[PDB]
Design a protein around this nucleic acid. Structure first.
Ligand SMILES: [Mg+2]
Ligand SMILES: [Mg+2]
Ligand SMILES: [Mg+2]
Ligand SMILES: [Mg+2]
Ligand SMILES: [Mg+2]
Ligand SMILES: [Mg+2]
Ligand SMILES: [Mg+2]
Ligand SMILES: [Mg+2]
Ligand SMILES: [Mg+2]
Ligand SMILES: [Mg+2]
Ligand SMILES: [Mg+2]
Ligand SMILES: [Mg+2]
Ligand SMILES: [Mg+2]
Ligand SMILES: [Mg+2]
Ligand SMILES: [Mg+2]
Ligand SMILES: [Mg+2]
Ligand SMILES: [Mg+2]
Ligand SMILES: [Mg+2]
Ligand SMILES: [Mg+2]
Ligand SMILES: [Mg+2]
Ligand SMILES: [Mg+2]
Ligand SMILES: [Mg+2]
Ligand SMILES: [Mg+2]
Ligand SMILES: [Mg+2]
Ligand SMILES: [Mg+2]
Lengths: 155, 141, 135, 204
RNA sequence: CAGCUAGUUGGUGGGGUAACGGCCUACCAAGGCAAUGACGUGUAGCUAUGCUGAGAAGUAGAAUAGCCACAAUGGGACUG
RNA sequence: AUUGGGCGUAAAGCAAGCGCAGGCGGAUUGAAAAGUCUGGUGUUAAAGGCAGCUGCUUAACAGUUGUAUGCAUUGGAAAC
RNA sequence: CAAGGAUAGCACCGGUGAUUGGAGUUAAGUCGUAACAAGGUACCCCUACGAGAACGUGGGGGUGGAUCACC
RNA sequence: CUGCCGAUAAGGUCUUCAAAA
């Protein structure tokens, strides 16, 4: 049940020797709402073929996501170009306080409570890039234990 | 132990060590050297207790007039470090003093915060245990 | 910049200017001083009625007016509606606005309030133009 | 103060007051959005704002509420302890006129409001005229006696069809209520929780 | 808005004030403040607080409450 | 943009240098304790703020108890 | 002792003013064609003079210049 | 192998849409 939601449908065009070749570009986010989420951008002469190719690309590149108590473990800033997205842990109940492309990514990943603010640009591809970068740099409290030789997070 | 190169260090003592650690991590280098100071010596002792570096040896010259500390980083088998990011709080000029009620928690306790309250440098958790705060040196996670 | 630099010269905020300055000037007349007190809408008297041409895209004949408010400021205010009773010498109750076609006009005349008549033959969005409910 | 075309608004959203009495009807069995522009394309892909506003209306039209009243109740429930997702559901279902209809003593919800406004209902130890009192499970909301004889009591006294969260002690018309309504008694007409977040942006 | 301040800075004896005090007096001196912003210009009752903001804070000093100032304008004094 | 921004090509590195005051600043030892942290006491008027409760048919509202912030003094800590 | 009055010359601030300077804004006005390609004389910066006007030339400075080229 | 070579009135379409098969 990998649900998918369009996050942007732009109208790109090149110029030839007379006229304008117009192709639709779609940005689809696919997520199983259990820890797997990917993004795919595709271009085609028509929306249906563009959507099919974008979903195919998105399903080809699926990253693995870990959730802690339904939220994000530690506050993180994802950077991608000039877009910086701040994610902050939230108590169980606030809901997803995100909006736009980031909100779509968080819902499709599985996370519930999440504090976000877009501190940079409003271009959907870079915000999604920043969101995925922020979520992928996250450190579990068990990897640092193997690293720092602590006691499975114990004080 | 002998050397061949001259050893220099920056005038600001927290970020000098911080720059050494960060550059070595990014460049995959392991063994680095710097001049030894007691504040720098104490912060390295708590770091090895927290398990971010492997060994930390302070040395002295044959005349007892100079000391240089040469530390190495703790890389795993696949060669990825334990330190992820370092950031200094009480920079020169603007010194950061926070009371106990505002003692920070770095990455929900995953990282360690260095606080030298009254008994030398001290970790955030034990600072909370004693309910006493003070100078905050740097964030390490 | 730097902590020391900002200590010497702090951060000065950019200012803010109004869009209808002439509506916030009050002349006392007994002392002849102008103080800056904001007021939503103000009464004036027209001096010259006529028509103006819009900027570039638009093409039409828009009815302007040179109305002098209870203060001493002369502002060109558009008569918002189809048909007017202005007769070069009359009293009007201006409001805020900014027509984009005519450069310089930044006020609108509240219709159907004082000497200016309402806009009859209007059944849609009347509450704004001022027409008695058909009933 | 309410609309007088409940068929139209129920037909638009698509969900009636849970008996499909306003959807079945005796004519044409119409299940299209009202107006001339009802049998058109562009059905799905409602924006997040669009579906949220449509859903918000569903919650506040099921009970005949004004949005300002909704904002007051949300501001009330918001502050307390934590994830209060069990409290505001009880709060929204605690309306006095709503309980009389779930009591089975009224043909319709807004008709029950009319009887409440006219003074034909009582409470554990006082009388109630305003159809907005927030009730708490445990009050013996006993019915009137001079209204048990009115020419409309027949279907009123047929409360044998009643929700399990409104216990009446049948034939005694005591009509208390315990065992707060679970989501099962709150059907899929409006069963969502991001309407709370919609009011979180609009209402602090 | 770069100099301002001649009772302005200090001492002496005396007078006056509920009281200390150039507050006033006679004499003796030449100091005081100022680039860490004097002085000048413009503006404004101050505060607890109101609205807004995740916060740091921004904004107005409704009502009311504390303090100050005023009573057509400018001075003086009696009674207490 | 202290928290929380930038200055090669988009606004922004003075043409360059000698440089006082200011800011910052090698290592070790001793003392003091001005910053820094902490304990005790006083105070920070009442209303308002947040939490709980009561009373008005519930609410709005009113009352009720709780609820900080800073300053001063005193007693310790000595890492910077 | 002293409000106020009269006389006197400086200081700061405001309004207005014949006439005049430039500026912005304007669907379809007149004289050129200076810049963007090697823009048809490469461009740009500082400076001096000159001309209806864009601008021309002299001095210095830059590549944020085309062509050119090398097995 | 460097003659000469100046101008071109105003405002304007055109992407409807993927819900899906
Ligand atoms: Mg061609
Ligand atoms: Mg003296
Ligand atoms: Mg005043
Ligand atoms: Mg903010
Ligand atoms: Mg007041
Ligand atoms: Mg007042
Ligand atoms: Mg910027
Ligand atoms: Mg530049
Ligand atoms: Mg330079
Ligand atoms: Mg320069
Ligand atoms: Mg030098
Ligand atoms: Mg110096
Ligand atoms: Mg030192
Ligand atoms: Mg108080
Ligand atoms: Mg009250
Ligand atoms: Mg011409
Ligand atoms: Mg040319
Ligand atoms: Mg030519
Ligand atoms: Mg040329
Ligand atoms: Mg001529
Ligand atoms: Mg010439
Ligand atoms: Mg030249
Ligand atoms: Mg030249
Ligand atoms: Mg040069
Ligand atoms: Mg020719």
């Amino acid at each position: 049940e990998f649900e998918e939601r369009i996050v942007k449908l732009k109208r790109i065009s090149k110029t030839t020797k007379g006229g304008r070749n117009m192709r639709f570009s779609v940005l689809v986010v696919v997520g199983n709402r259990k820890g797997k989420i990917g993004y795919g951008i595709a271009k085609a002469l028509e929306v249906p073929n563009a959507i099919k190719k974008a979903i195919k690309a998105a399903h080809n590149s699926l990253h693995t996501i870990e959730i802690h108590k339904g939220s994000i473990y530690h506050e993180v800033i994802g950077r991608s170009g000039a877009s910086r997205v701040l994610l902050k842990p939230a108590p169980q109940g606030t809901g997803i306080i995100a909006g736009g492309a980031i909100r779509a990514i968080i819902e499709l990943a599985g996370y519930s409570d999440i504090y976000t603010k877009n501190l940079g640009r409003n271009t959907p591809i870079n915000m999604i890039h920043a969101t995925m970068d922020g979520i992928l740099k996250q450190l579990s409290p068990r990897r640092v234990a193997i690293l720092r030789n602590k006691n499975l997070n114990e004080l | 132990i002998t050397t061949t190169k001259p050893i220099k260090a920056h005038f600001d003592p927290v970020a000098d060590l911080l720059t050494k650690i960060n550059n070595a991590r990014k460049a995959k280098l392991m063994t680095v050297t710097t001049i030894a100071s007691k504040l720098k010596i104490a912060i390295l002792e708590i770091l090895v207790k927290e398990g971010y570096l492997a060994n930390f040896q302070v040395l002295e010259n044959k005349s007892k007039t100079k000391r240089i500390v040469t530390f190495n980083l703790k890389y795993t088998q696949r060669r990825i470090p334990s330190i992820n990011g370092v950031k200094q709080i009480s920079k020169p000029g603007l010194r950061i003093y926070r009371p106990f009620e505002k003692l920070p928690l770095v990455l929900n306790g995953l990282g360690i915060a260095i606080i030298s309250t009254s008994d030398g440098v001290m970790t955030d958790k034990v600072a909370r245990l004693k309910k006493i705060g003070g100078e905050i040196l740097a964030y390490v996670w | 910049a730097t902590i020391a630099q900002l200590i010497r010269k702090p951060r000065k905020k950019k200012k803010v200017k109004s869009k209808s300055p002439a509506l916030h000037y009050n002349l006392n007349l007994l002392n002849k001083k102008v103080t800056n007190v904001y007021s939503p809408l103000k009464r004036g008297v027209c001096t010259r009625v006529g028509t103006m041409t819009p900027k570039k895209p638009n093409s039409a004949l828009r009815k302007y007016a040179k109305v002098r408010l209870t203060n001493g400021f002369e502002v060109l205010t558009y008569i918002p509606g189809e048909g007017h009773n202005l007769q070069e010498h009359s009293v009007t109750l201006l409001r805020g606005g900014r027509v984009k076609d005519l450069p310089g006009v930044r006020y609108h005349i509240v219709r159907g309030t004082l000497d200016t008549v309402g806009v009859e033959k209007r059944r849609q969005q009347r509450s704004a133009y001022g027409a008695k409910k058909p009933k | 103060k309410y609309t007088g075309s409940i068929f139209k608004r129920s037909r638009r959203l698509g969900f009636s007051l849970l008996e499909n009495n306003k959807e079945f009807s005796k004519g044409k069995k119409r299940k299209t959005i009202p107006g001339q522009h009802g049998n058109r394309f562009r059905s799905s892909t409602m924006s997040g704002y669009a579906q949220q506003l449509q859903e918000k209306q569903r919650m506040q039209y099921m009970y005949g509420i004004t949005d300002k009243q909704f904002r007051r109740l949300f501001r009330l429930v918001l502050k307390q302890r934590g994830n209060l997702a069990v409290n505001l559901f009880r709060v929204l279902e605690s309306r006095l006129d709503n309980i009389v209809y779930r009591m089975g003593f009224a043909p319709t919800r807004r008709s029950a409001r009319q009887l409440v406004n006219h003074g034909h209902v009582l409470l554990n130890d006082r009388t109630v005229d305003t159809p907005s009192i927030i009730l708490n499970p445990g009050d013996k909301v006993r019915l009137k006696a001079k209204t048990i004889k009115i020419p409309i009591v027949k279907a009123a006294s047929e409360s044998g069809v009643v929700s399990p969260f409104v216990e009446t002690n049948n034939k005694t018309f005591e009509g208390t209520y315990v065992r707060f309504p679970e989501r099962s008694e709150l059907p899929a007409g409006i069963n969502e929780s991001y309407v709370v977040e919609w009011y979180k942006r609009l209402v602090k």
